[PDB]
Write a protein that binds this ligand. Structure first.
Ligand SMILES: Nc1ncnc2c1ncn2[C@@H]1O[C@H](COP(=O)(O)OP(=O)(O)O)[C@@H](O)[C@H]1O
Ligand SMILES: Nc1ncnc2c1ncn2[C@@H]1O[C@H](COP(=O)(O)OP(=O)(O)O)[C@@H](O)[C@H]1O
Ligand SMILES: Nc1ncnc2c1ncn2[C@@H]1O[C@H](COP(=O)(O)OP(=O)(O)O)[C@@H](O)[C@H]1O
Ligand SMILES: Nc1ncnc2c1ncn2[C@@H]1O[C@H](COP(=O)(O)OP(=O)(O)O)[C@@H](O)[C@H]1O
Ligand SMILES: Nc1ncnc2c1ncn2[C@@H]1O[C@H](COP(=O)(O)OP(=O)(O)O)[C@@H](O)[C@H]1O
Ligand SMILES: [Mg+2]
Ligand SMILES: [Mg+2]
Ligand SMILES: [Mg+2]
Ligand SMILES: [Mg+2]
Ligand SMILES: [Mg+2]
Lengths: 7, 368, 368, 368, 368, 368, 7, 7
């Protein structure tokens, strides 16, 4: 979340 | 001219001038849009509110943070926040002051690149610099050796520094911070019948956390005490006059820092993270790191956090070594204080990235 | 030219010119038809009567209200009343004055569509607007935050507004108003032996209600006092000179606003409806709403209504909440006063519906 | 002996015996009380009515739901409902059968405790268990992996399950279900000229919803179509013989599930909630969750709901993901069917909470 | 009977029968245990998973390697892994076959002693033997002279051998292997925007490494080419359908083998280590060692590894020396192939440690 | 003025003034340079450290010895060592004092030539001399006859002397000294599970050797005793507080001096080397050499070294020969003590190489 | 509503 | 780490 891939 | 220090945290903006002992402007990093439709024509109603004004009007707004986990996700909102802090809060012309910004370690490169691009192109700042928050936390403490545990609203990280040399291979980072604790507190308050679902009620729950939560020295002993007596229960008054009582939720919320499994993460607690960071370092500097465990950031403000961390590390580390945790009273503003100190040193006045340098070497200059 | 503002309530027409301090024409919205055979050629008898003249000749007329529960049920009569309002009361030419009309919330859309169709295609007004009565009532109070409790002759409704933003999901409507109280008073007056059955006698009963009724602070104690004494009895003189005396009916009639079960409705009272409307809103704005209970409409003119509402709301709402009920002496004309204010604002002049765009888009425009 | 399965939802009570294919008794969770004065002494007036008795006598009754948003708010009425279920509907001795109950996730703790206490001390059941409805939906669907979107009368929730392991950190819940749609339809129908204000009329509106409402695949195009043609209109006959025509209100009502802003909630639609719940799970889990979207509960019975959900999820999720939605024709009773399957399993017989355990541990046992 | 050959390295377990061409069982050395709460009864939920089963269910499991840097750290997990290998993969009776194990050079003695004890007592094997992996690599290569460079998942070591005689004083060991490269890649992907923190996500990064990484023949020119163009970028699809693009990180990961300072290690690269090992040998041997550099293990499977090693060694070694690096297409299984060859030789049958010898002389027999 | 005596050993620098009983400056011959990036501007980030300051900060430094096997390999660092010695430890002006240096026998000529050139051209010392270390040790012993066995950190050599006449044809030299023993101890500590790799950890292993190692009188008996009882085990605490246990490694490491095959050397032990050197001399000299077997250097400080040497030489030498191993208590500084004695003699004042002689004859004058 | 605090 | 003393 709020990254680009994971999270 | 005096430089500008702007600690763009993920939960609060802390801005001021280099040399001052505390930031002038401190307001939540919030942007709110009206969600209902206006009916009155004679008002000066505007389409967006920022900072404190958004908190005051939160009833009719959808609040949303532009920064999550130390990464900027909305750049228009972030530009609005920066415009607010420069003009309405500090009341300065950015083109007259060099600006010192901050970031967490292990962040995406594009984040710094776009931050520099906005600072130079939009605000026409003469020069700027982007520092690492944990490093500034050490300046704030005056020492030059220690392992800094910085825990803000979005990101928690460790940075071991020895004699002014950083050990980047030992830097650790968790995406578990005050935001996740607020969400978990929202989740567990339902067990008592209180339902907070809107974004404006997330702020109420954040206030409840800030005012009533604390860290247990021994989690199971407190759990037993809570079930045995109401001595731990406290009451909080909501904005509409309701009074809500919370018991073991007071210390279950911050316990998530030491047991991230409470929120589904398999990461290690902050105590294990700092111990592992220390053990990633050379055997000859561990004794100094163990004795200079520095804390900074808002989420390190829970009562009993220092004692719990000391007990945990003392359990993890071998005996015959003095575990000592430095928890200054000004932990909340330590990063900004350090940035203020750094921006004033005469030795630093050659580390600024000048507009002349930037507009010829490209945005990649910021990674020097 | 000046803009006309007239709110066609279920019971009264209040018309005038925007900018004035009070409506110029105020007459009941009734249309009377003769119900007997004419036996004099030289009387120059009229086929129908409207407004004050109908009220004067009520003896030989059958009186009909074209508006019921804020819904126009007879359009020929409503058009007749509008024609009266323009060409006999105000004595204007509608083609050169833009007219501002009002209606209750949660009304049928066809009502507004046909209203605007008549306004444009029959009277050929240059432009017109239709406003919600509660918003105008709040305008007249000179504030932008508050929950308005409008109670006219046909409809009682609550409209929460916070900083100019309406919360339409919290709007409450209740089809219980002055006319229902008049009918109930007609019913209970039979217990004393007075029989009012004709439409003409309903006007006498309405006058009795307006001049003798009040709201009991504590219903049960007042009932006991009336039973145990004659101190509360008053007397009234009918048009024919006969005298009648009214006992506990003085406060039993308006008590229906707080106990609608007296007339068979299972809806909640106005106090509980207001409380429910407030609790439909966001938690953060309830504190401001509690302190800005604005009253308007004819049926809010019963003595002691404000105190009774304050007592009931304080009983319902939690402690620590400042509950203040604003009841201006000019409550009866709050909607018209607000409409006068709104129509005179310069910023409002962009919100008219000109006949050109009405022709371009048709009556469906009014809902935009 | 044979075990009892009772699905005490907010709208209906579905009770029966374990091992049967369908619930034996299905009646509304209603308690009615007379609101007028009896004038015929000889008749059996009766002080209160339950279930279908109240529904058939709704003309003279005021109907009240003891459950609201999955939380029991009136415990006397709920005891009355359970007594009806056990004795008049199933005609069993509750002390001779163990009972399996259900409740929504993230409910207040006291709800289970009071439920268990009433079941053990009032009905004297030998043993009982309280399950999560979304889990029983998978048993009914006969699979071990999937994300269940259960939406009944009071509460909508998502629960991801993988290989029989629940991910409680990813469980979502909305307080927006069939009852809110019924209220919105009541409000929306006013604009067409129909007024439904009493509790007995809420049931007529709920019947209209069940009969005529559907989910539009493309909301804006559907709105455009209905405004240009009457092909979408349907007619409904009220109990007294009046016929009402309903137009675009047919699909504007269930659209609230995807745009909760219609009723003033700022939460996300059910599609967004499901997608967010999936994104809360580990990256290796998401492939299987996308392919096993299981729907259950009454409000998932709108025609076109499955297609709309698939379209929205496909829009949100990345391409190359095989998004599939399972919508059994018996979605309404999936929770009860799963409870029946579970209660009959031999491996489950160790999980019953016998009254001995309740006596020696109290209500707290139910949270283990 | 035929003998077993089990090359239980840090990353993978390769097991089979002596004399067979390739290993029969090849599964990761992983033990996973559930990290979530189970909610569905029975359905074959095991308390732990091993090997390929753990990989499939890695979404709900926390994965742990029992071997780190060639040293067994959890003997319960290692007993579990061996039990799996013998009974579920090979499906053989351990007591019917003598087993050949392998170990890295310069390992703790207690490791080998405990391994022997477990093999003789827990599995009741008739006889066993422990071999140095680099020696078996030469058997697989089919030559008796050469310097082996074995790089697995945990350790990288060099073992010079000349005419069948080892040179223990010239053996070099380097605790830097595939796992460290995986961790560095995990760290390095964050600067591009992707976060991989869980144990299961660490398996995705390993797959990205095994598929997209390669060794650059000239690091600085490769970095310049990557910076000035996108021709080097590749895309990889995650299990949830998200697509990531990886650029110069493709060759920066394996570059750590030649510049261990990238991960904070002070050691020298593999080329420097091999050259130093060769220089530790006698002057008359170095010519034959330069021409027989045998590479082995999985970590030597990067494209361009052989060319880079040859270039670096030629740079370090004097001219007129024929530097030659032998890289068979099946380096991954070279250790197992050599073990297969060794166990089949007739001259080796006297080297087995029979259980009689073990129990009559204690574990120390394995050091002979 | 008084002369300077500087014993530039491979491991330690011992400097002082002629005539003093003990050297004034004794610090390790080590030069460290940072191996991480400095992040704090205010810190005094010196680019290199020498001697004691390098030991203190060894956690962040990479340590390099400029002298290996008595040969200077890095002149730019040897210059730093000498600059430190003169200007920070002794704190004298080198041009005001003649300097006496030391070298091992059979060293390269270029070593001495470069040493003289650096002394005369950079420090511009007035006059200097280079002496063989064994002769100085004999001077310190206060005798004119004997066979010296000097073993330091880089070299072990024997020098027979009879009545002041050196027998250069009998000189012996082994490139096996304290550093090789430290490396071997690092190697064998791996057997117990301790891993020391970095140059900084080599200093920890050197300290372990200096504190816990001793020479066994009979190696095999000591090994048997160690393998049967724990009485020979000791504990040592590392800088980070973790404690290691060392057993038979205590006497296996020094045993390499008598069995160089332990480290792969074909050479003979020190006892055999000294016996061969004695046998190289004339038959009439051997009787005195047997009785004047002097020992000097740090590596001869192991307890039990003298007894083992005497036992071995008695085993080698014929009976009826009296063998003495003269081991003063100050062997560490025998070379420097002798240099101080020699430098202060009046007869030696003609042996200095003056600056004018160097200028006129060139660097070759030093071989006089 | 129907809860204990908010809603 | 996996060892006994250092690393
Ligand atoms: N007294 C307090 N006790 C506990 N938590 C606090 C307290 N004050 C602030 N916090 C938490 O710290 C967070 C902000 O910390 P800070 O580091 O100052 O901002 P940022 O995270 O933006 O850098 C908030 O989200 C809040 O939840
Ligand atoms: N002094 C009074 N006391 C009580 N009720 C009054 C009084 N004056 C008027 N009313 C009631 O108010 C009603 C008219 O209310 P108003 O809002 O002025 O017009 P409308 O309701 O048509 O918009 C009348 O039907 C009458 O019964
Ligand atoms: N065929 C249908 N179409 C649309 N809505 C329906 C249909 N049947 C039931 N519903 C709605 O579903 C609700 C009941 O769903 P259900 O899950 O069975 O109740 P609960 O779970 O609350 O016991 C009712 O309130 C009704 O409005
Ligand atoms: N095709 C490949 N390219 C690059 N690296 C690989 C490849 N295949 C395997 N590896 C690496 O090799 C390691 C395993 O090496 P191997 O020697 O076969 O097993 P072990 O380390 O157990 O002996 C894995 O951790 C993996 O990172
Ligand atoms: N007490 C001791 N026991 C064993 N070895 C020692 C002791 N003290 C010093 N040493 C060894 O002696 C070496 C240095 O000896 P010395 O001759 O004084 O210096 P150099 O070798 O430079 O001339 C060191 O490497 C150290 O390992
Ligand atoms: Mg911060
Ligand atoms: Mg009115
Ligand atoms: Mg249900
Ligand atoms: Mg291997
Ligand atoms: Mg020496």
């Amino acid at each position: 979340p709020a990254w680009l891939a994971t999270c | 001219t005096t430089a500008l220090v702007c600690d763009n945290g993920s939960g609060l903006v802390k801005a001021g001038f280099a040399g001052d002992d505390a930031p002038r402007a401190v307001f939540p990093s919030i942007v709110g849009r009206p969600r209902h439709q206006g009916v009155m024509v004679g008002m000066g109603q505007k389409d967006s509110y920022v900072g404190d004004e958004a908190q005051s009007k939160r009833g009719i707004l959808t609040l949303k943070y532009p920064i999550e986990h130390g990464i900027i996700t909305n750049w228009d909102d972030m530009e609005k926040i920066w415009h607010h802090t420069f003009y309405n809060e500090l009341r300065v012309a950015p083109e007259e002051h060099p600006t010192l910004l901050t970031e967490a370690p292990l962040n995406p490169k594009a984040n710094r690149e776009k931050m520099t691009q906005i600072m130079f192109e939009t605000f026409n700042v003469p020069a700027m610099y982007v520092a690492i928050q944990a490093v500034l936390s050490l300046y704030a403490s005056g020492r030059t050796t220690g392992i800094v545990l910085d825990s803000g609203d979005g990101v928690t990280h460790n940075v071991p520094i020895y004699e002014g040399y950083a050990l980047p291979h030992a830097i650790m980072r968790l995406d578990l911070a005050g935001r996740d604790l607020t969400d978990y507190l929202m989740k567990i308050l339902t067990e008592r019948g209180y339902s907070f679902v809107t974004t404006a009620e997330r702020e109420i729950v954040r206030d409840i956390k800030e005012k009533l939560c604390y860290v247990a020295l021994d989690f199971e002993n407190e759990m037993a005490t809570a079930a045995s007596s109401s001595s731990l229960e406290k009451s909080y008054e909501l904005p509409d006059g309701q009074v809500i009582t919370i018991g073991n939720e007071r210390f279950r919320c911050p316990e998530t820092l030491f047991q991230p499994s409470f929120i589904g993460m398999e990461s290690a607690g902050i105590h294990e993270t700092t111990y592992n960071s220390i053990m990633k370092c050379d055997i000859d500097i561990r004794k100094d790191l163990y004795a200079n465990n520095v804390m900074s950031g808002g989420t390190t403000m829970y009562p009993g956090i220092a004692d719990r961390m000391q007990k945990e590390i003392t359990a993890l580390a071998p005996s015959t070594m003095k575990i000592k945790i430095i928890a200054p009273p000004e932990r909340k503003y330590s990063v900004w204080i350090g940035g203020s100190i750094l921006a004033s040193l005469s030795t630093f006045q050659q580390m600024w990235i000048t507009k002349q340098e930037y507009d010829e070497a490209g945005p990649s200059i910021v990674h020097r």
